[PDB]
Design an enzyme around this catalytic site. Structure first.
Site, PDB file in Angstrom:
ATOM      1  N   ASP A 193       0.869  -1.173   0.000  1.00 35.49           N
ATOM      2  CA  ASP A 193       0.000   0.000   0.000  1.00 35.49           C
ATOM      3  C   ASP A 193       0.911   1.230   0.000  1.00 35.49           C
ATOM      4  OD1 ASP A 193       0.762   0.578   2.632  1.00 35.49           O
ATOM      5  OD2 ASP A 193      -1.234   0.852   3.487  1.00 35.49           O
ATOM      6  N   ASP A 195       1.156   5.020   2.089  1.00 37.29           N
ATOM      7  CA  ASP A 195       0.702   5.722   3.287  1.00 37.29           C
ATOM      8  C   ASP A 195       1.079   7.196   3.211  1.00 37.29           C
ATOM      9  OD1 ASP A 195      -0.053   3.290   4.895  1.00 37.29           O
ATOM     10  OD2 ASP A 195       2.033   2.825   4.369  1.00 37.29           O
ATOM     11  N   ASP A 249      -3.570   4.743   2.268  1.00 33.37           N
ATOM     12  CA  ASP A 249      -4.014   5.201   3.573  1.00 33.37           C
ATOM     13  C   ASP A 249      -3.718   6.682   3.694  1.00 33.37           C
ATOM     14  OD1 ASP A 249      -4.875   2.716   4.406  1.00 33.37           O
ATOM     15  OD2 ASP A 249      -2.949   2.224   5.369  1.00 33.37           O
TER      16      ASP A 249
HETATM   17 MN   LIG Z   1      -1.053   1.397   5.103  1.00 39.03          MN
HETATM   18 MN   LIG Z   2       2.240   0.785   4.101  1.00 46.99          MN
END
Ligand SMILES: [Mn+2]
Ligand SMILES: [Mn+2]
Ligand SMILES: [Mn+2]
Ligand SMILES: [Mn+2]
Ligand SMILES: [Mn+2]
Ligand code: NA
Length: 325
Positions: A193, A195, A249
DNA sequence: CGGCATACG
DNA sequence: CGTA
DNA sequence: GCCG
């Protein structure tokens, strides 16, 4: 070698990769069985090996190392003597481990949900797709996008995503900043992912910002899934002649809290748990991603930088690339 | 033996 | 319950 | 599973 991971540099790449990966299999399997204590010990033992300056070649070299007792030492001894640990291999090929790993890697599914599905006889993703009413909206999104979400995000993807988030953030609140955090800030070249941490230099101006950012990203057609100060999204990322889903995120913090949030969201996960454990048990201070509290004076430490926080805690400063515990 | 990090959505 |  |  100190006993807490936050007391020693841990680089991203190291000299005991095979040994640490084996211990981390046993840690993961302990988690799947709900034994958080055994998970922590196996994670800590793996991390000790990551921090060593050269390869372990002989069992002798484990003497004196923290978190190596009879069990973790036997795992290493078997890998050193036969190149394989029977226990680790038994876990790897077990139906339980393989299925819990497949299910828990779905966005929206944790150990408790995966275990219940496992006990119901479920074993594959198509088994879950065949009964959609047994699924939350979050799980439906995790399963529809599961293939894309299983492909690594590259550092090249990250810079394109950051420009897009900055554009929406700048319209939502002129002057607001976007900082890359997570594993990419620790030097990883790939990730599951991306962030981002968002703040504004004027304390309080960040209030209400995240809804405004999300609305603008949604209006640009970039949000495949979203559900406040933290947003766990699936973004539509351009690709040559098409696109792919990516987990992103987004987190907002006031500038007063930004060093604590930066520290927490930069990780690693084990580094942060160890740092909080150290803070409470060795220094009597309570640490989270909002601040650092002295419960005897009932006051919060003010920090202007991560360096401040390490100094408060009596720890030598570690840059993000040495927090890969 | 008890402890094992600590939040938000 | 999920998420970080 | 390991530590203090
Ligand atoms: Mn994350
Ligand atoms: Mn991450
Ligand atoms: Mn044992
Ligand atoms: Mn908050
Ligand atoms: Mn006990
Ligand atoms: Na999951």
């Amino acid at each position: 070698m100190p006993a807490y991971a936050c007391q020693r540099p841990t680089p991203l790449t190291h000299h005991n990769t095979g040994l640490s990966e084996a211990l981390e299999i046993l840690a993961e399997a302990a988690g799947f069985e709900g034994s958080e204590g055994r998970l922590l010990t196996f994670c800590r033992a793996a991390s000790v090996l990551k921090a060593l300056p050269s390869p372990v070649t002989t069992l002798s070299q484990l003497q004196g190392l923290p978190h190596f007792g009879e069990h973790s030492s036997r795992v290493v001894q078997e890998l050193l003597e036969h190149g394989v640990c029977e226990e680790v291999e038994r876990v790897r090929r077990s139906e339980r481990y393989q299925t819990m790993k497949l299910f828990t890697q779905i966005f929206g599914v944790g150990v408790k949900t995966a275990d219940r599905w496992y006990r119901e006889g479920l074993r594959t993703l198509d088994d879950l797709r065949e009964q959609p009413q047994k699924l939350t909206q979050q799980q439906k999104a995790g399963l529809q996008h599961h293939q894309d979400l299983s492909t690594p995000v590259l550092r090249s993807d990250v810079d394109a995503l950051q420009q897009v988030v900055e554009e929406a953030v700048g319209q939502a609140l002129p002057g607001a900043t976007v900082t890359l955090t997570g594993g990419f800030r620790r030097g990883k070249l790939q990730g599951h992912d991306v962030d981002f941490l968002i703040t504004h230099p004027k304390e309080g101006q960040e209030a209400g910002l995240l809804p405004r950012v999300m609305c603008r990203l949604q209006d640009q057609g970039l949000i495949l899934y979203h559900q406040f100060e933290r947003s766990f999204c699936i973004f539509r990322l351009p690709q040559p002649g098409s696109w792919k889903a990516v987990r992103v995120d987004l987190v907002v913090a006031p500038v007063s809290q930004f060093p604590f949030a930066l520290l927490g969201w930069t990780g690693s996960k084990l580094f942060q748990r160890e740092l909080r454990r150290f803070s409470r048990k060795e220094k009597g201070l309570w640490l989270n991603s909002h601040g650092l509290f002295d419960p005897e004076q009932k006051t919060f430490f003010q920090a202007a930088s991560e360096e401040d926080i390490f100094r408060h805690l009596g720890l030598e400063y570690l840059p993000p690339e040495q927090r890969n515990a």
